[PDB]
Amino acid sequence: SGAIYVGNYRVVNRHLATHNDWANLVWEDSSRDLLVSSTTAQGCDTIARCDCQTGVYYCSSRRKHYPVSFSKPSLIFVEASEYYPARYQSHLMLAVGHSEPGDCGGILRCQHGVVGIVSTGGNGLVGFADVRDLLWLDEE
Numbered sequence: 001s002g003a004i005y006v007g008n009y010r011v012v013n014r015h016l017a018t019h020n021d022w023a024n025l026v027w028e029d030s031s032r033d034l035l036v037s038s039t040t041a042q043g044c045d046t047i048a049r050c051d052c053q054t055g056v057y058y059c060s061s062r063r064k065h066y067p068v069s070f071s072k073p074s075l076i077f078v079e080a081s082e083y084y085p086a087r088y089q090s091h092l093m094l095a096v097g098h099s100e101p102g103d104c105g106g107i108l109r110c111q112h113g114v115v116g117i118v119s120t121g122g123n124g125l126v127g128f129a130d131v132r133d134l135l136w137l138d139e140e
C-alpha cells in the first residue's frame with residue numbers, strides 16, 4: 001500500500017483505489033496501473049520534474065529503503081496477476097531490487113521529489129509506475 005499527496009490530489013495504484021477514490025475520480029489509466037482522486041486537505045509531497053535514473057524506494061516487505069538505478073518509462077509486458085490479465089503496462093520503469101505484491105504503493109524518489117510508485121515485481125526486479133509526466137498534478 002501507499003499513495004502520493006500533492007496539492008489537492010491523491011495518487012494511488014489503480015488496483016488499490018477505494019470506493020471514495022472512484023467517487024472522487026480525477027483521472028485513471030488501466031494501462032499505467034494509476035488512479036488520481038481529489039482531496040479536501042492539502043498534501044505535502046513534491047513531484048519530480050526531471051529525467052533522473054537513480055533514486056531510493058521504500059520496500060515494505062523488507063522495512064528498508066534501497067538506493068536503485070532504474071530504466072526510463074517504457075511499455076513493458078507484465079505477467080497475469082490477481083488484478084489484471086497478462087498485458088503491456090505503459091510508463092513503467094524497472095530496477096534490480098526486491099518487490100512483492102503488497103509492496104505496491106511504495107514511493108521511488110530522487111533529489112527532485114517523487115518519481116513514481118511500486119507497481120510490478122518478480123524475478124529480482126521491481127517496477128515503478130512513473131508520475132513525472134503528469135504535469136497537471138502541480139496546478140489547479
Ligand SMILES: NC(=O)[C@H]1CCC(=O)N(Cc2cccc3c2OCO3)C1
Nearest residue numbers: 033081083099100101119120121122
Ligand atoms: N501493475 C500490475 O500489473 C500489478 C497488479 C497487482 C499485482 O499483484 N502485480 C504483481 C506484482 C506486483 C508487485 C510485486 C510482485 C508482483 O508479482 C510478484 O512480485 C502486478
Ligand SMILES: [Zn+2]
Nearest residue numbers: 050052110112
Ligand atoms: Zn530527479
